[PDB]
Amino acid sequence: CSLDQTVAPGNLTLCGNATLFTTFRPKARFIAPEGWMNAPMGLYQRADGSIHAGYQSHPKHIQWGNISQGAAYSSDFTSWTDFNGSEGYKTIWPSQIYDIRGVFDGSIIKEGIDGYPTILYTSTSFGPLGATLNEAEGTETQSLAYTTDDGASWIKLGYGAGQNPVIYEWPETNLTGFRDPYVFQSPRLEALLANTTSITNATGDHFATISGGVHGDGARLFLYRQHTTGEFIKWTYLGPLVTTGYKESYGEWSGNYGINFETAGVTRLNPAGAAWDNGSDTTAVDFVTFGTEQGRADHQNHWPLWAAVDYEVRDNGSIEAVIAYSGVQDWGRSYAYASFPVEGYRQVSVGWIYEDDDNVILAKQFGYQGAFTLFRDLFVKVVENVSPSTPGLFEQASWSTKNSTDGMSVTVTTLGQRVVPETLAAYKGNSTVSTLAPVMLNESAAAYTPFSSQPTDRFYALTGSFEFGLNTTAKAGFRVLASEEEYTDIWFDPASENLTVVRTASSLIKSFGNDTELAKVKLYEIVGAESKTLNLTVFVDGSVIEIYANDEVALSTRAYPWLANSTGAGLLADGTTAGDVVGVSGLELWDGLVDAWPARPANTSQGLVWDGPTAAMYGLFAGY
Amino acid sequence: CSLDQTVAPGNLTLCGNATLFTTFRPKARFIAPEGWMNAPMGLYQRADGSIHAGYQSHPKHIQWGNISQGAAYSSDFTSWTDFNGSEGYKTIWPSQIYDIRGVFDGSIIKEGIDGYPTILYTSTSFGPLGATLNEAEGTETQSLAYTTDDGASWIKLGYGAGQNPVIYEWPETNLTGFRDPYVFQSPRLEALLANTTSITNATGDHFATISGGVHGDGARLFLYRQHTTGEFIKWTYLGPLVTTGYKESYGEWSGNYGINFETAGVTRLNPAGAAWDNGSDTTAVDFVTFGTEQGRADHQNHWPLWAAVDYEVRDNGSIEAVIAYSGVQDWGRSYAYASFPVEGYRQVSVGWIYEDDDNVILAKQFGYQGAFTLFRDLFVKVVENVSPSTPGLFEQASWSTKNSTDGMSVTVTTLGQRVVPETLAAYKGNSTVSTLAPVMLNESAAAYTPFSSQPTDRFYALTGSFEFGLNTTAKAGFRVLASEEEYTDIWFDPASENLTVVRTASSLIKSFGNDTELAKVKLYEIVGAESKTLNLTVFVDGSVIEIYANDEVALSTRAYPWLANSTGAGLLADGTTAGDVVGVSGLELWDGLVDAWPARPANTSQGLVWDGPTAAMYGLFAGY
Ligand SMILES: *[C@@H]1O[C@H](CO)[C@@H](O[C@@H]2O[C@H](CO)[C@@H](O[C@@H]3O[C@H](CO[C@H]4O[C@H](CO[C@H]5O[C@H](CO)[C@@H](O)[C@H](O)[C@@H]5O[C@H]5O[C@H](CO)[C@@H](O)[C@H](O)[C@@H]5O)[C@@H](O)[C@H](O[C@H]5O[C@H](CO)[C@@H](O)[C@H](O)[C@@H]5O)[C@@H]4O)[C@@H](O)[C@H](O[C@H]4O[C@H](CO)[C@@H](O)[C@H](O)[C@@H]4O[C@H]4O[C@H](CO)[C@@H](O)[C@H](O)[C@@H]4O[C@H]4O[C@H](CO)[C@@H](O)[C@H](O)[C@@H]4O)[C@@H]3O)[C@H](O)[C@H]2NC(C)=O)[C@H](O)[C@H]1NC(C)=O
Ligand SMILES: *[C@@H]1O[C@H](CO)[C@@H](O[C@@H]2O[C@H](CO)[C@@H](O[C@@H]3O[C@H](CO[C@H]4O[C@H](CO[C@H]5O[C@H](CO)[C@@H](O)[C@H](O)[C@@H]5O[C@H]5O[C@H](CO)[C@@H](O)[C@H](O)[C@@H]5O)[C@@H](O)[C@H](O[C@H]5O[C@H](CO)[C@@H](O)[C@H](O)[C@@H]5O)[C@@H]4O)[C@@H](O)[C@H](O[C@H]4O[C@H](CO)[C@@H](O)[C@H](O)[C@@H]4O[C@H]4O[C@H](CO)[C@@H](O)[C@H](O)[C@@H]4O[C@H]4O[C@H](CO)[C@@H](O)[C@H](O)[C@@H]4O)[C@@H]3O)[C@H](O)[C@H]2NC(C)=O)[C@H](O)[C@H]1NC(C)=O
Ligand SMILES: *[C@@H]1O[C@H](CO)[C@@H](O[C@@H]2O[C@H](CO)[C@@H](O[C@@H]3O[C@H](CO[C@H]4O[C@H](CO)[C@@H](O)[C@H](O[C@H]5O[C@H](CO)[C@@H](O)[C@H](O)[C@@H]5O)[C@@H]4O)[C@@H](O)[C@H](O[C@H]4O[C@H](CO)[C@@H](O)[C@H](O)[C@@H]4O[C@H]4O[C@H](CO)[C@@H](O)[C@H](O)[C@@H]4O)[C@@H]3O)[C@H](O)[C@H]2NC(C)=O)[C@H](O)[C@H]1NC(C)=O
Ligand SMILES: *[C@@H]1O[C@H](CO)[C@@H](O[C@@H]2O[C@H](CO)[C@@H](O[C@@H]3O[C@H](CO[C@H]4O[C@H](CO)[C@@H](O)[C@H](O[C@H]5O[C@H](CO)[C@@H](O)[C@H](O)[C@@H]5O)[C@@H]4O)[C@@H](O)[C@H](O[C@H]4O[C@H](CO)[C@@H](O)[C@H](O)[C@@H]4O[C@H]4O[C@H](CO)[C@@H](O)[C@H](O)[C@@H]4O)[C@@H]3O)[C@H](O)[C@H]2NC(C)=O)[C@H](O)[C@H]1NC(C)=O
Ligand SMILES: OC[C@H]1O[C@@](CO)(OC[C@@]2(O[C@H]3O[C@H](CO)[C@@H](O)[C@H](O)[C@H]3O)O[C@H](CO)[C@@H](O)[C@@H]2O)[C@@H](O)[C@@H]1O
Ligand SMILES: OC[C@H]1O[C@@](CO)(OC[C@@]2(O[C@H]3O[C@H](CO)[C@@H](O)[C@H](O)[C@H]3O)O[C@H](CO)[C@@H](O)[C@@H]2O)[C@@H](O)[C@@H]1O
Ligand SMILES: *[C@@H]1O[C@H](CO)[C@@H](O)[C@H](O)[C@H]1NC(C)=O
Ligand SMILES: *[C@@H]1O[C@H](CO)[C@@H](O)[C@H](O)[C@H]1NC(C)=O
Ligand SMILES: *[C@@H]1O[C@H](CO)[C@@H](O)[C@H](O)[C@H]1NC(C)=O
Ligand SMILES: *[C@@H]1O[C@H](CO)[C@@H](O)[C@H](O)[C@H]1NC(C)=O
Ligand SMILES: *[C@@H]1O[C@H](CO)[C@@H](O)[C@H](O)[C@H]1NC(C)=O
Ligand SMILES: *[C@@H]1O[C@H](CO)[C@@H](O)[C@H](O)[C@H]1NC(C)=O
Ligand SMILES: *[C@@H]1O[C@H](CO)[C@@H](O)[C@H](O)[C@H]1NC(C)=O
Ligand SMILES: *[C@@H]1O[C@H](CO)[C@@H](O)[C@H](O)[C@H]1NC(C)=O
Ligand SMILES: *[C@@H]1O[C@H](CO)[C@@H](O)[C@H](O)[C@H]1NC(C)=O
Ligand SMILES: *[C@@H]1O[C@H](CO)[C@@H](O)[C@H](O)[C@H]1NC(C)=O
Ligand SMILES: *[C@@H]1O[C@H](CO)[C@@H](O)[C@H](O)[C@H]1NC(C)=O
Ligand SMILES: *[C@@H]1O[C@H](CO)[C@@H](O)[C@H](O)[C@H]1NC(C)=O
Prior knowledge:
Bound molecules: a molecule of 10 linked components (NAG-NAG-BMA-MAN-MAN-MAN-MAN-MAN-...), a molecule of 7 linked components (NAG-NAG-BMA-MAN-MAN-MAN-MAN), a molecule of 3 linked components (GLC-FRU-FRU), 2-acetamido-2-deoxy-beta-D-glucopyranose
Number of strands of chain A: 38
CATH topology of the largest domain in chain A: Tachylectin-2, Chain A
Protein name (chains A, B): Beta-fructofuranosidase
Radius of gyration of chain A: 24 Å
CATH superfamily of the largest domain in chain A: Glycosyl hydrolase domain, family 43
CATH architecture of the largest domain in chain A: 5 Propeller
Oligomer: homodimer
Number of domains of chain A: 2
Largest sheet of chain A: 7 strands, antiparallel
InterPro entries (chains A, B): ConA-like_dom_sf, Glyco_hydro_32, Glyco_hydro_32_C, Glyco_hydro_32_N, Glyco_hydro_beta-prop_sf
Keywords (chains A, B): Glycosidase, Hydrolase, Signal
Family (chains A, B): Belongs to the glycosyl hydrolase 32 family.
Domain Glycosyl hydrolase family 32 C-terminal (chains A, B): 453-590
């Protein structure tokens, strides 16, 4: 095993465990110290204002198993500190018959058991578990634990009648899944249900959704309500909140609803952020965010989606969330988005970016798998004075339109996402910032034009505003992690409305994924404008490439170039001419970003272990 | 619910939990503080000379489940103190994927991991588990834990490759069971295998048996040897030690070998007690003790047996224990005998006495189930100068015979059992002792003759020597727990060789078992004697009646008389005449015995709990 990054890569499968630990590793974002991670969980803002972030964790392994909550905290979403207790950075782990198969995703009741922060989580036990298997009742249940030390440790309720697990009966037969409880308060839902509480007797101030579906008949999001305020044992099933069809698709802008939901949550937003009104705010919109499985040919069969919904009250005292429009939270290699409330009327969302090594060829050599996305403020994105001649505008696919009284302009509403300002400020302030001169891309434009200032490593951010003609057929964008022989191309093609990440040359190492990523982006044309603009921001962080367009479209992906000098970046141009010109302005490079884990050494591997021959006997975990 | 024991019992099923806690409860023996107990486990003499006793335990329940090690200690086998830690009186419990279904029986390596006492135990996980089910590999494995605080707590080895569980591969396919590891040192077996260690490479000083069987083909005791001295991870399977047939019986004196062995152990004894010679002691005999299941129509389908064995060395470096003669360790409601070494060349055996409420009618009202037997010294019982005209003597069923050179007398050898002297001394010294005049039972004998001194409660011991004519047809014995309306009759009938416990009148409460207990007892007639003698000792301890004959035959059973005055005792006589006389001598009553748990209050119930609806979902434990 040679680690010489000045020559072509050898057979890297001969390299030892964690020998490639630092080679491709993000430095500027949330990531476990080592080993396997997946979904964010247990997210909450603590009493001191800091953020507690949990994650699905399997230390010293590079595949999923014995799944536990790893945890850390931060005052600014950006610089983090690991918890360190008797189980290292874990704070909840399988320990009881009801959760011994895995401590799955859960969410936080801020004022819970004895007034303490309390997690409601999916406690798993034995038996077939999965949307494509014959799962039975009891395999997935929902259980409580609380913390008396602000997340350093959690105490589970006892096992038994009137204690854990607190939710165990399936609300309908033949479920594809029954997990990922999302607990939330909702003045909106309370107001809607207030006239029906005699029917159900459920009057608590917390609601919970559980994600699942029904075999052969599509996904379901089940709504429960806390039966009595201040009491956390009894949760009353109201009814299905979201019901979709077996592999139903709302269309090209909306992914596919698959067969089963995972990590679903419910929020209410207005243009500024989170909305906590009872329905009286006419600018507020109700949203559900949710993962779907088995409705996609690639990306691990997973779509991270969202929908704007209009609530209807059923005669039996339940709520139907009728989908008004439906979109995609991230178009790339991410999933398991969780959102949580943050002071100052914010709702913040974060997901998991998986690797692109699905055949598990170099995972042991990494010594870890997975990272988070950046933390994102959610809000209602409102675009005013939109031209009615914007192509495809009245499809109203993942947005709504409201015509002006005179019919000459439109107001567009959709889900907005932007990186939390704390992270952008910290990134910029710790980076070498190069403000770049604007560039007209015309007949003289090369295919690739390096920026006048270059990155010094694989940790940087770039932004630019690309102004296109209304009938352009030109393509433009950014090339990143670039040398002569390796590079990743991010293109926007206004004629097709497609944002693509072409990865055919991303790496000389042939075992990593190289499929082209694709997102749809609607450039809402403004009344009186003779052009249309794409604001494109890209974060490069080890192997992560995380792309944001117009505070709306997100696409996370992976690139693993071998060569030490595959760090460059610049502008891409295709079919730009004297007549079909792309004006690029607002160009800026941030080199360095932030060291997100200042207390960690460069190599936090503790080695990898094998569970031994019993892993295959039990049949629950891969064992490595 | 009336608790008036001066009148007939009402409907006691209306009584609350643990309302009958003290009514029938043993006071003079080892018993858990409350709830369910079964098999003794983890038995060892600690460095300070005290005895550590573990037991299969399910606190706050009255059926088996979440099975754990409860523990206590004693300096004299007789007066005990509970451990008290974070889990009350438990010291090992289900906590890992490999043992979450139950911490089953295990035994002690005195100088184990890092020099500490170490338990090798059956760690159970999910799946069908049982001799009549389709069990698979992995459901029962064997794991290690060690104690740094003399049994107050145990630390398990980690889960994984080269750690726990340490034995997981089935030695043969289609096992009926794979549990109850019994670890022991054996100069005998080491000497026998010393010439074959090149074949197996197993040279350690500890052996371990694992109890089981093969579907359709009878029970098996599998022999392992520690691969290397001072190392405890690697155990090498040598071969089957004991192989018996599907429901094979050695005869009327030997129970039935059933389909599967449980709690089997291996020892070597001589007339004084334990023998640690390499084979050079010609007075020493190798014994296996073992439970069998599904070879009995009653007594929970369970026989606690023993066999004298002659070891043969196989060509593959394993040992065949060929059964020379075969007997019964206890003929009544006991099972799960464990034996362990005690200083002064002793091997001490103790079992579990279950209740006689198999339909679980009053178990909740008790608030507990089960107790131990008394602790018993094992030894080789040798009877000299036996008359060749002793009926059935040369059947050599559960004994061996050696003729004198002249053929006129025989030496009989069998397994001896007697209550440990520490317990007899403590019992006698703390009791009101009445030494009773001898009684000739003849034509004037009533059916029942009360002793001249009577017990004052349900805690007493009695002994007597019954001298019978060689051709008697008379029966005699003891009546205990007796009033006019309730009593339990213990009869010996020399003509049939049957010791019986008739329980048709044991209690006015009709839900308890009332079947007649039966043991075979061989009165070895002595050359020149014109009579034959039965030495019969009976311990009455709450509901336990524990009977010993001739330091050889043991029979444990249960009686639950309701009336407060059903405590009396005396002599039984049937068919005694002027000519057929039974001389009773050496009569003595010990009233009171010992308070075995002096620190415990009278009622140590902590209430009972229900596991809730998930118990049936998981399908592992009854849930109460
Ligand atoms: C199979 O068997 C298994 C083993 O038996 C069984 O698991 C066990 O289940 C039981 C029962 O559910 C659990 O017991 C509970 O424990 C809770 C606390 O748990 C935390 O702390 C314990 C103990 O910690 C000590 O010991 C450890 C180990 O040495 C140390 O690490 C600690 O530092 C600490 O040490 C100190 O104390 C020791 C003595 O205890 C000393 O020896 C020592 O020197 C130190 O001084 C830990 O062991 C726990 O860890 C385990 O669990 C966590 C997850 O929780 C895992 O991550 C971890 O790996 C371990 O597995 C854990 O950290 C108790 O709070 C709980 O007690 C209450 O609940 C019951 C009702 O169910 C009540 O009877 C009781 O009164 C308590 O409730 C009161 O208090 C709470 C708040 O405190 C209130 O909310 C409640 O309303 C109530 O209030 C009352 O009192 C108030 C105040 O007075 C009053 O105001 C009110 O009005 C009211 O009256 C319970 O004891 C046990 O933890 C499990 N153990 C394990 C190992 O799993 C399993 O379930 C079985 N399975 C099946 C299928 O049956
Ligand atoms: C799913 O995830 C699960 C959770 O992660 C996982 O279970 C966990 O598995 C790990 C890995 O196997 C276990 O970790 C081991 O722990 C052993 C000790 O275990 C006992 O103590 C711990 C910790 O106790 C502290 O914390 C608790 C809880 O707060 C307190 O109650 C205690 O009082 C104590 O508190 C103090 O310390 C804290 C910090 O640790 C402080 O915060 C605190 O303030 C106090 O100061 C307990 O938690 C354990 O309880 C659990 O387990 C018991 C059964 O064992 C249960 O009954 C109970 O309910 C709990 O479940 C327990 O009591 C460690 O000994 C062990 O460490 C060694 O082994 C590894 C190799 O595997 C080595 O890397 C390491 O070096 C250690 O080995 C050395 O030392 C031993 C002797 O000590 C030697 O034999 C050995 O050769 C080696 O020697 C070396 O050093 C020598 C000396 O320098 C030298 O001479 C030699 O030459 C050599 O170099 C390991 O860390 C962990 O306990 C499990 N936890 C739980 C909750 O289950 C599970 O397996 C996963 N499942 C799957 C399927 O993957
Ligand atoms: C005395 O000790 C007991 C522990 O032994 C304590 O707890 C009680 O334990 C008993 C079992 O011994 C429980 O009985 C079972 O109850 C089931 C139905 O429960 C629901 O209704 C009752 C009555 O209104 C409620 O009290 C329960 O509420 C509690 O539990 C819920 C969770 O469900 C919690 O949310 C609450 O907070 C409470 O904790 C429940 O709502 C019942 O299905 C079950 O069924 C069988 O058993 C009886 C008797 O054998 C049969 O008649 C019947 O046919 C069923 O038999 C089954 O047999 C086998 C399985 O064994 C199957 O093959 C069959 O098909 C069949 O299903 C049983 O009756 C009791 O619920 C529980 N009480 C609790 C927790 O409060 C007592 O509390 C304790 N007393 C005191 C004062 O401390
Ligand atoms: C680097 O990290 C790893 C952890 O990932 C550490 O541990 C190693 O982990 C790997 C798995 O990643 C283990 O590989 C597996 O080994 C199985 C056979 O093991 C035995 O032989 C080896 C080699 O001589 C011994 O080292 C082992 O000894 C250890 O374990 C025993 C317990 O058995 C202990 O008693 C010892 O003390 C040791 O701890 C064993 O004796 C092997 O069966 C398994 O099989 C497959 O995997 C490969 C690669 O994918 C395939 O080629 C092959 O076809 C098998 O594929 C399976 O795929 C699926 C299941 O995934 C099935 O559907 C198929 O049917 C098929 O079975 C695998 O190769 C390795 O044993 C283990 N080593 C240990 C514990 O020492 C490393 O130690 C660590 N390195 C360092 C330096 O720290
Ligand atoms: O960690 C559990 C947690 O993650 C979620 C959301 O993705 O489900 C994950 C899921 O897959 C994981 O487990 C498999 C092991 O077979 C592993 O290959 C995969 O990489 C993991 O993401 O967990 C169940 C059980 O494995 C799968 O059906 C599901 O796809 C979330 O729903 C859950 O709380
Ligand atoms: O506690 C386990 C321990 O006991 C032994 C010896 O008797 O096996 C007991 C055994 O039965 C127990 O469990 C059943 C529950 O179905 C209960 O009804 C019974 O009263 C208990 O004695 O355990 C297994 C699994 O339950 C049974 O097949 C077996 O009969 C010993 O072998 C083991 O270590
Ligand atoms: C980058 O590295 C490769 C391999 O060392 C080399 O061939 C190339 O010239 C380097 N310089 C660049 C891309 O500017
Ligand atoms: C569907 O549900 C029932 C239990 O409600 C179960 O018997 C059945 O096996 C399930 N699965 C299928 C494939 O029908
Ligand atoms: C309420 O009605 C809806 C629509 O029919 C149904 O899906 C849901 O199960 C009902 N809620 C119940 C039975 O609690
Ligand atoms: C919205 O505006 C467009 C363009 O003026 C028009 O075609 C459409 O009918 C309008 N919709 C409504 C509801 O008035
Ligand atoms: C650098 O990053 C840290 C950690 O996020 C942040 O607190 C600090 O303000 C940043 N430095 C600047 C803006 O100069
Ligand atoms: C644009 O994307 C869609 C997928 O939504 C695809 O069908 C189409 O071929 C793409 N067109 C171009 C030119 O990239
Ligand atoms: C024993 O008690 C019962 C019921 O109180 C009574 O009938 C009987 O006379 C009592 N005395 C005895 C058996 O000596
Ligand atoms: C017997 O053993 C094999 C595995 O060795 C297994 O396939 C089979 O199902 C077992 N049970 C029966 C009843 O044959
Ligand atoms: C040794 O031979 C015996 C008798 O054939 C056999 O039962 C046992 O399995 C053998 N031991 C092995 C293969 O380790
Ligand atoms: C043992 O003694 C009996 C009675 O004397 C006799 O019948 C039998 O043959 C003797 N056995 C041997 C081996 O000499
Ligand atoms: C009474 O019993 C205790 C506890 O077993 C024992 O130590 C003591 O010697 C006994 N009293 C006597 C013999 O007087
Ligand atoms: C004595 O016991 C045996 C069982 O071993 C039985 O067959 C026989 O009938 C009994 N005889 C009498 C008279 O009790």
